[PDB]
Each structure stands twice: as C-alpha cells, then as structure tokens.
Design a protein around this ligand. Structure first.
Ligand code: WBU
Length: 124
C-alpha cells in the first residue's frame, strides 16, 4: 500500500528532465503518473531537482502550511519546477493541461522517520 513518501515521489518528482520538456508535458505526465485515473486532478507541480535536494528541504526553512499545520518547509534556493493546470476545455477522461515551467522556491510538508516530503504545499 503506497506510502505517503512514495506518493509524493509519484505525484511531484521528475528529476529525469531539467524543465518542462514541451507544451504537452503536463498532458503526458499527469496521465502517466496516474493523476487522471479517477478525475482530472486540477492542479499539480513537478519538481526537476534531485530527490536528495528535494528531501533536503525538510531541514530547511520552517514555515506554516496552508492548512495551518507547522510541518512545512520552504527551499532556501529556487528549484526548477513545472506547474500543471487543467484547461477550461478539459473534459475527463481527456484531461487537458497547461504546461508552465518556472524557477521558484518550493514549500513541502514533511513527516515520518526518516523525515521526508509527503505533500507539495506551494511554490513562491
Ligand atoms: N498549491 C499547490 C498544490 N499542489 C501542487 O502540486 N502544486 C501547487 O502549487
């Protein structure tokens, strides 16, 4: 039964590319990572850094989570990410996404032993 940490990796890690490959990046990735299985997940972010670098964020700048919990952390450096956002025209099961590359600080929630990312909270 997929752990929270594995789920974070599936939903949010893509070290294989350095930045939104193409205009159809999100279309392919949202599907291949099984984020369009039961619905069109409206919004999702992929991080293009090493797993080590992203895991390291859990020991970086402690900030409040959007839900009010205290276990969020913001990266000291900007990281290469891609946001995926469902287009107005998107209709399940043909989930359509706008692919946007950027370089931003990430905020993740971390839990467990080992203390690792289990939720992507925001980019800033
Ligand atoms: N706010 C967010 C929630 N979840 C994501 O994957 N990306 C975001 O930017």
């Amino acid at each position: 039964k997929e752990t929270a940490a594995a789920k974070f990796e599936r939903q949010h890690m893509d070290s294989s590319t350095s930045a939104a490959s193409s205009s159809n990046y999100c279309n392919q990735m949202m599907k291949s990572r099984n984020l369009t299985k039961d619905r069109c997940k409206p919004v999702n972010t992929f991080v293009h850094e090493s797993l080590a670098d992203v895991q390291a964020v859990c020991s970086q700048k402690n900030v409040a989570c959007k839900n009010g919990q205290t276990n969020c952390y913001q990266s000291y450096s900007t990281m290469s990410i891609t946001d995926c956002r469902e287009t107005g025209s998107s209709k399940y099961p043909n989930c359509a996404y706008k692919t946007t590359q950027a370089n931003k600080h990430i905020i993740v929630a971390c839990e467990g032993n080992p203390y690792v990312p289990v939720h992507f909270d925001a980019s800033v």
